[PDB]
Amino acid sequence: MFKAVLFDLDGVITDTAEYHFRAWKALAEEIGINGVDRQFNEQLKGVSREDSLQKILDLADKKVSAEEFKELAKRKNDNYVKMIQDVSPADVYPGILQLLKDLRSNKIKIALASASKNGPFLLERMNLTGYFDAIADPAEVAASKPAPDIFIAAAHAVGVAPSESIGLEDSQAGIQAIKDSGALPIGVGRPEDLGDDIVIVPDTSHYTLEFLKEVWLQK
Ligand SMILES: [Mg+2]
Fold this sequence. Notes:
Blueprint: E1 4-7, H1 17-31, H2 38-41, H3 49-58, H4 66-83, H5 96-105, E2 109-112, H6 119-125, E3 134-135, H7 149-157, E4 165-169, H8 172-181, E5 184-188, H9 191-194, E6 199-201, H10 209-218
Parallel strand pairs: 1-2, 1-4, 2-3, 4-5, 5-6
Helix pairs in contact: 1-4
């Protein structure tokens, strides 16, 4: 059987998309840039903090120093961290808590493979820390997704090779990172975004222990 499951956070366990949006909108209002509405915010999902800020500045052809750029990015992050104080167990995606319970009762290892600097905090707020055997520290990896580094670290941290593991992801870059690690990917989303050479489910309610076992069998 597989010996471990390697979880992304955003888009698999939960999301904090409403909070990132309110933070960028508040920042744009403060500095007087029109146009940061829900539809525009779709261009910021999956994009780095610094690329997101540049896209906002480009709405007004605005030019800033390195020091001003750093301060704006810090203000947005400060507001984002204040707002995620209200994350709770209600924010866990459908199916995820049952999957965690079933993996733990079958002695299958569980690891977080997320780029979030707030990963341990968010798991504590959702009451999930007791299910996790390890959290890969994104500060200690050399390269981000689609590089495999974070998935290799997550598997190693629970004492397995990536070839013994399943990885769960909602992004094309994450799926590529899983493939290149040697783990088996199962995506959540649609093949237009994720590829059509991997198994995909439409939402997280479909991630059950029996479905993972069927996928591993067919491989
Ligand atoms: Mg994700």
